[PDB]
Write a protein that binds this ligand. Sequence first.
Ligand SMILES: [Mg+2]
Ligand SMILES: [Mg+2]
Ligand SMILES: [Mg+2]
Ligand SMILES: [Mg+2]
Ligand SMILES: [Mg+2]
Ligand SMILES: [Mg+2]
Ligand SMILES: [Mg+2]
Ligand SMILES: [Mg+2]
Lengths: 10, 10, 236, 236
Amino acid sequence: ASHSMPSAAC
Amino acid sequence: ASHSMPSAAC
Amino acid sequence: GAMGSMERASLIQKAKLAEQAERYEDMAAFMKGAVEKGEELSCEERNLLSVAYKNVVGGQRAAWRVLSSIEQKSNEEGSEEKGPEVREYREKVETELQGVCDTVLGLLDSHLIKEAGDAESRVFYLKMKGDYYRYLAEVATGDDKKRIIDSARSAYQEAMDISKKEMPPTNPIRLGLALNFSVFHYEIANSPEEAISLAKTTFDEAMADLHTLSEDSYKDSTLIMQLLRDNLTLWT
Amino acid sequence: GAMGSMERASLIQKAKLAEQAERYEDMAAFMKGAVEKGEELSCEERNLLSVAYKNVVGGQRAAWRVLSSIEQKSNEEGSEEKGPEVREYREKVETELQGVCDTVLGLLDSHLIKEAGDAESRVFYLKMKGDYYRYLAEVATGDDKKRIIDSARSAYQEAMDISKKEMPPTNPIRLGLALNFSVFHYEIANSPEEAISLAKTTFDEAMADLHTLSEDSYKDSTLIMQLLRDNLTLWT
Ligand SMILES: [Mg+2]
Ligand SMILES: [Mg+2]
Ligand SMILES: [Mg+2]
Ligand SMILES: [Mg+2]
Ligand SMILES: [Mg+2]
Ligand SMILES: [Mg+2]
Ligand SMILES: [Mg+2]
Ligand SMILES: [Mg+2]
């Protein structure tokens, strides 16, 4: 239910 | 886009 | 086989857990192991086998269509040459898809079809045979393409002949068979009129038999009838 | 490795095709092959590596949670004993998940982190290290659980220290790091107040730096800020 992020915009 | 079916209700 | 040491009942139990977990490659391996025990399959077990492999080959077919589209665009006029990689990777997914179809066909031939005597089991397996030859035909391009198409047609035709003699027009096996054979005619055999005729006749004969059904059977049959109507709307 | 004979550029090309086809196991194998060529990764290549493995481990984590829920229910009072199969199949998926995490950690340790000198690459890899120790901690129960949690904390802390010295408060790497470290505090470390404090401070410091950004950078940063706000809404 928590949000996480794998990428990082270039 | 066409529909097909794999199972058959018992 | 890697499932040879596991009990039949434990393989079935784990196939159901795998379905709940959306682990369809596992689900298919468990059901392959259960078939290889050599005993016939119950109705529920037949449906577990077909759902597992439908989900595996369905992901492969979706990937193959994306890759084939990119490959065809790269072969248009004005498109930049990018080397062998698109073709190679389409071939990789194709070969994996073919391997899955060959595995299912092999289970049917050794020995599910020959031991199926009741109409419900025999028709179910012959339909599956037609379906997996159909998936082979979607990617076929060489010397055996015609023979692959004819193998799908022959399995579907034998299933149709038994279903018309032994089952009512609302039976869900008979309806799903007719649905998938109509798709074969439209998408594989270049026979759209045969596809539309079969879908229409199947729908109308089922409508006239609904009055014989319980509420639960009516729900099962009308769900498949709606798919026939949705295809007729797409094709006409 | 099975990708050792393929050119670096062809592995990258195929990873992008695999992403379009939703073939994330293939995508991860192609990117593992590219890392093993020994050259540093560009920004775009780092994101391909992380998207591939996130999708693979994400399906494993979702399956593990379904199976763990069924296992815990079977251990309640009044629940029927059904044998070892639920535990066995949860263990199977767990061991596969652990294997994927160990593969990613091994790529980071041999040799991505030690060759990353710029802040953007070093912070990205240290964040990934914290993330894959976090996924190990979600399934850990034995003598090494505390040490697994501390390895995640230590990687996230080193990444935070570099990011605060070298990057603006709106940088998307810095924001995604803080987001995922806040999740670590809430879900792994039993530290909800630390989680809420970090998310709040990160959000407020980013808001005050948005005025420095182009329209495109503003869109990138505000997307991650919304995730911080959504977690704060769930946790308060
Ligand atoms: Mg993440
Ligand atoms: Mg089907
Ligand atoms: Mg036995
Ligand atoms: Mg390839
Ligand atoms: Mg028999
Ligand atoms: Mg080279
Ligand atoms: Mg198992
Ligand atoms: Mg360097």
